[PDB]
Ligand binder design. Structure first.
Ligand SMILES: Nc1ccccc1C(=O)O
Ligand SMILES: Nc1ccccc1C(=O)O
Lengths: 344, 346
C-alpha cells in the first residue's frame, strides 16, 4: 500500500480495498504520515463517504494503540452517552450521562477539551469541578466508587496526537469525528450515540453491529446529534449483530415540541450553569431532552441482557431518568463525583 | 470574512466557493501563511468538488501577482505556449517539447514554462540536449528575441509557490494545482495548445482562457492523453474572442495512421533527447506524427489571434507548416541555435 494509491482511489470516489484504511491509520498512529497526507486522507475519505468496513478499520487500528483500563475494572454493562458533534449538544450528553449514572447504570465517557476531534465534554466537566485528567487506575476507582468515569482522550490515545493536530488545523469535521464514540478506551458495550448526519449515523451503526454491542445510534431529523424534541428522530437500534432502523417520535410519550435554538449548548460556563439548573429541578425543553436521551441510554443498557421489549423499556427508562433528577440522585451523584476528585 | 473552516466546510459540502474565497486561499498559500494540512485539504477538497473556471481564474491570478514578470515589451505579442497539465500516469512531455521546437522553427514565437520533471516537466530533456533552462527574465527575453523560443523555469519565476509544490509532492495524486502551470506562464502568452488528461478539467481550463480572451486550443485525447493523440480521436475546445466551440477531432481525416499508445510514450532524459534528435533529423513514424499534429494545433491557435479562419484549411496549412519546419532542417537548426545561445551566456 501507499499514499498515492490510497488517496488516488479516494479522490476517484472509490471505496478502499480491505486493509487499506488500516494501513493508512497505522501510518498516522506511528508518526509516519506527513501532515499533508493525514489531511488529504481525512478530507478525501469524508468526501467519498466512508463505509462501515473502512471506519471499523480506522477505529480498530486506533484502539490497538490505546491504553486500556486495568483488567476487570469496567463493569460488563457500562454505557457511553455521546454525540459526534453538530452547534453542539455537550450540554445534553453531559447531563444525560450524569442522570443515567444516578439511575444506577455505570457510565464511562470519553472526550477531550474542545474544539476537539474526539467530542468535547471535558471543559463543561471541569467547569463543574470534575477532575477530568485521570489515569486508568483512578478512572477505574471512579467507576467503582461513584458509578461514572471519564477517559481523557490525550492520556488514553497519545498516539492520536498527529491526527488531532491536523484535525485542528483544518477546522472542518471529517471522518475522524466519527472515531470518538468508536474508540472509547473502556470499550463499553452499550450506549446512546448521536450523529449530526443520517448517512454517517447508519455507518456507525454498522460498525457497532459488528461488535458485541447494544447501542442506539441516534439522529434528530432536525440535524441534532442526539434524540431531539423538536421533531422526529431516526434511530438505528443495534443488537445481536443486527440493525433495526426506525422513526421515533417522543410526542408518543407526552414530550411537547420544542425549538432547536432551545436545546443547543453554549460555552463551558453556560453549560455548567445549565447542568446545575436541570439537576436542581428546572423544568423546560433542556430537561426534556436530557430525560429523553438518558432514557435512550437506559434502553440500550437494557438491551444487553434484558428481554424487555421496546415500548416497556422506553417507559421504564423515562421513569428512571426522571426519578434520578426529581429525587435529587443526579445532583448528589455529581457532588459525589466532584468530592471523589478532590479527595486525592 | 474568509477562513479555512469556512472555505473547507463549503468545499467538503460539495459547494462552489463564494467569489473571493479561492483568491484568499491562494494568497494564504503564496505568502507562507497556510499550514501544509490546510494546503492539502484545500487542494484535495477543491479537486473532488470539481473546480469552476471562476475558482481557477482566482487561483491563477493571485499566483501570477506573486510571480516575477518578463521585462516590458520583451515578449512578442503573438507568442504561444505548447503544454499539457500532466498525462494520466503516462509520460507525454517528449511531445510538447518537440512540438514547441517545431512551432518556433515555423516562425511562431514560443515561450514555455515548466520544472525539472516529476514535479509541467520538460526541463530535464532540454538540459540533456544542452539547453540552459534556468535563466532570469532578461535572458529569457533575449532568447525569445534572438532564437524565437524561451523557457521560464518555474522555481525561478514562482518562488512563492514552493509551499504548495512541497505539499503537491507529498500527496502524490493530481489535484487542481496541476491546472496552474498553463495558466500562470510568466510570459503570459495569449495563445497556445494546452492539453489536459481530464475532459471536465479541460473544459474548465477553456473557460479561464475564454475569460482572458486568449486564442487557445484546449485538447483532450479520448484515450486520456494530455496532448492531441494519433491513437484515437480527441476533444478540442476552440477558444477565441471570449467564446468556446467544443469539437471532436479525428487525425484520420488528415491521413494519419492509428498508432499504439506505447509508441507515443518514452522515459528518461537521455532517451527523450535521442527521440528529439531523431524526429528533428527527419525520422518518420508515430512520434513525428504526434509532434506534427500538436505543432499544427499551436499554429492554428496562433492564427486565431488574427483571423478566425476556417477550421479545416487552417489545420492543413498548420500541418504543412509543421512538416516543412522539420524537413527543411529548420527545426533541427533552431534547436542548435537555442543551444548556442545558452553557451554564449558565459
Ligand atoms: N485529541 C488528542 C488525542 C491524543 C493525543 C493528543 C490529542 C490532542 O488534543 O492534541
Ligand atoms: N514547482 C515549483 C514551482 C515554483 C517553485 C518551486 C517549485 C518546486 O518544485 O519546489
Amino acid at each position: 500500500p501507499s499514499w498515492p494509491q490510497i488517496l488516488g482511489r479516494l479522490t476517484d470516489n472509490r471505496d478502499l480495498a480491505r486493509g487499506q484504511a488500516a494501513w493508512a491509520m497505522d501510518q498516522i498512529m506511528t508518526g509516519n504520515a506527513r501532515p499533508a497526507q493525514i489531511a488529504a486522507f481525512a478530507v478525501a475519505m469524508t468526501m467519498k463517504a466512508p463505509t462501515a468496513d473502512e471506519v471499523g478499520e480506522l477505529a480498530g487500528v486506533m484502539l490497538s494503540h490505546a491504553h486500556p483500563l486495568p483488567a476487570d475494572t469496567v463493569p460488563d454493562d457500562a454505557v457511553d452517552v455521546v454525540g459526534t458533534g453538530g452547534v453542539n449538544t455537550v450540554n445534553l450528553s453531559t447531563m444525560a450521562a450524569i442522570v443515567v449514572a444516578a439511575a444506577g447504570v455505570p457510565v464511562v465517557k470519553h472526550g477531550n477539551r474542545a474544539a476537539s476531534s474526539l467530542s468535547g465534554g471535558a471543559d463543561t466537566l471541569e467547569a463543574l469541578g470534575v477532575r477530568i485528567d485521570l489515569g486508568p487506575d483512578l478512572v477505574a476507582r471512579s467507576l467503582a466508587e461513584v458509578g461514572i468515569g471519564f477517559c481523557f482522550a490525550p492520556r488514553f490515545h497519545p498516539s492520536y496526537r498527529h491526527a488531532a493536530a491536523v484535525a485542528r488545523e483544518i477546522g472542518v469535521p471529517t471522518v475522524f469525528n466519527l472515531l470518538g464514540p468508536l474508540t472509547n478506551p473502556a470499550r463499553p458495550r452499550a450506549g446512546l450515540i448521536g450523529c449530526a448526519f443520517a448517512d454517517l449515523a447508519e455507518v456507525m451503526a454498522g460498525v457497532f453491529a459488528a461488535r458485541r454491542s447494544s447501542v442506539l445510534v441516534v439522529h434528530g431529523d432536525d440535524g441534532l446529534d442526539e434524540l431531539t424534541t423538536t421533531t422526529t428522530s431516526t434511530i438505528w437500534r443495534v443488537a445481536a449483530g443486527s440493525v433495526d432502523k426506525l422513526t421515533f417520535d417522543p410526542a408518543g410519550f407526552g414530550f411537547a415540541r420544542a425549538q432547536l435554538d432551545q436545546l443547543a449548548g453554549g460555552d463551558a460556563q453556560a453549560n455548567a450553569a445549565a447542568v446545575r439548573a436541570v439537576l436542581g429541578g428546572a423544568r423546560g425543553p433542556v430537561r426534556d431532552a436530557v430525560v429523553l436521551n438518558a432514557a435512550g441510554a437506559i434502553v440500550a443498557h437494557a438491551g444487553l441482557s434484558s428481554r424487555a421489549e421496546w415500548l416497556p423499556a422506553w417507559e421504564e427508562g423515562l421513569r428512571r431518568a426522571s426519578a434520578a433528577i426529581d429525587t435529587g440522585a443526579a445532583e448528589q451523584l455529581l457532588a459525589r463525583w466532584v468530592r471523589f476528585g478532590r479527595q486525592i
